[PDB]
């Protein structure tokens, strides 16, 4: 056995729990069991992998996994997705430095609980569900079988708190015939740390995360899999999943009973027509991007930065013209910015790191916080 805990405000508690033998039975292979639970989430899965599968160092592994996402409770407008999958990869140990993914893999995802909103029946429609606009009653269920790949380079000097070298993961996914969704997904993320003295203690991190993804035949990518920006990992100073476009209701009613007194973004009471809301939904494309200056920490294994964050998410498929009446959620342009300072403490209770930042770029509908955190002990 071997356990997580953790706090913080991405993601309110955190447990994981689980079992991984590194030689089984002295096989060679690893295989693990594995759970977690967020204020979110819960996942959960079976893993087995041969490192040494050709003798060269080609690995070749397995994943069966099951997972709850409850949308509301990431500060998403609302749905429920259970699903559940699998994956099989070859991994491609390169050089010292590089290393090379490509798999297959089979994930069933099954929707339900959705709120109405543009953006969601929109992807709905794509996929000849026609459901109606007065429910929150629906469900969709889906079956996809992808084919994946990733490139990872790593030169590092240090993996915990780097001084020097870069970073660089490339991600990518594309849906194979037989699937009920047609889509692809690529994501590309950069870190590089340049020192400027020779004591290496003054040090300027660039960081940078690119996503975009789209429908293939005349389908569109499905919700589930949208980008989000803002928060501890990505733009600090914004609240966890704020940045970008923003659910658009329909004239609605109630899940099962409708009382007061609280939400209802859309509710009947008092409806007529679409509602424009701050429940974020988030988007096909995106781009963050951060510099920061690293120094040594007054007055005192601890360190401490002052950066500059900043960000976009949008949704290439919103109607422009049609929801005129409506902000422009296909503009890239609206780039939401912060600054602030950052201090992290890898201590004896576990790692620890904070930050405090001042969001000051924000669009309509942005929800700040200046003070982020997450604390973690392992077993």
């Not at 969709?140 to 030169?155: C, E, I, L, P």
């Not at 290496?200 to 940078?208: C, D, E, N």
């Not at 939400?263 to 920061?292: F, I």
């Amino acid at each position: 056995m071997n356990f997580g805990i953790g706090y913080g405000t991405e993601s309110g508690v955190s447990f994981q729990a689980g079992v991984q033998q590194d030689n089984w039975l002295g096989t060679g292979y690893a295989v693990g069991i594995n759970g977690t639970k967020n204020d979110y989430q819960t996942y959960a899965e079976l893993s087995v992998t041969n490192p040494y599968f050709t003798v060269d160092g080609v690995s070749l592994g397995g994943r069966l996994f099951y997972n709850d996402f409850q949308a509301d409770d990431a500060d998403l407008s609302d749905y429920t997705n259970k699903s559940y999958g699998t994956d099989v990869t070859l991994g491609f140990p390169i050089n010292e430095y590089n290393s090379l993914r490509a798999g297959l893999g089979y994930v069933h995802n099954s929707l339900s609980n959705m709120q109405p909103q543009v953006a969601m029946w929109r992807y709905l429609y794509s996929m000849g569900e026609h459901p109606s606009t007065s429910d929150q009653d629906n469900s969709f269920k889906t079956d996809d079988f992808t084919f994946n790949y990733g490139w990872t380079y790593n030169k590092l000097d240090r993996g915990y708190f780097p001084t020097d070298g870069s970073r660089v993961n490339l991600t990518g996914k594309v849906t194979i015939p037989g699937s009920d969704n047609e889509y692809y997904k690529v994501t590309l993320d950069t870190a590089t740390y340049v020192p400027i003295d020779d004591d290496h203690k003054w040090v300027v991190l660039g960081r940078t995360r690119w996503g975009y993804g789209d429908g293939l035949g005349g389908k569109e990518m499905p919700f589930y899999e949208n980008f989000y920006a803002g928060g501890s990992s990505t733009v600090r100073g914004f609240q966890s999943n704020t940045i970008g476009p923003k659910a658009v209701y329909f004239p609605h009613q109630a899940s099962n009973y409708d009382p007061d007194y609280d939400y209802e973004c859309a509710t009947q009471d008092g409806a007529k027509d679409l509602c424009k809301s701050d429940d974020a939904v988030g988007g096909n494309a995106m781009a963050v991007a951060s510099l920061e200056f690293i120094t040594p920490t007054p007055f005192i294994s601890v360190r401490t930065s002052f950066f500059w964050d900043m960000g976009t998410v949008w949704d290439t498929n919103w109607d422009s013209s049609q929801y005129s009446g409506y902000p422009d959620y296909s503009d890239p342009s609206n780039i939401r910015m912060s600054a602030g300072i950052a201090l992290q403490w890898m201590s004896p209770l576990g790692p620890l790191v904070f930050s405090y930042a001042q969001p000051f770029k924000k669009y309509d509908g942005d929800k700040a916080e200046q003070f982020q955190f997450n604390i973690g002990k392992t077993w």
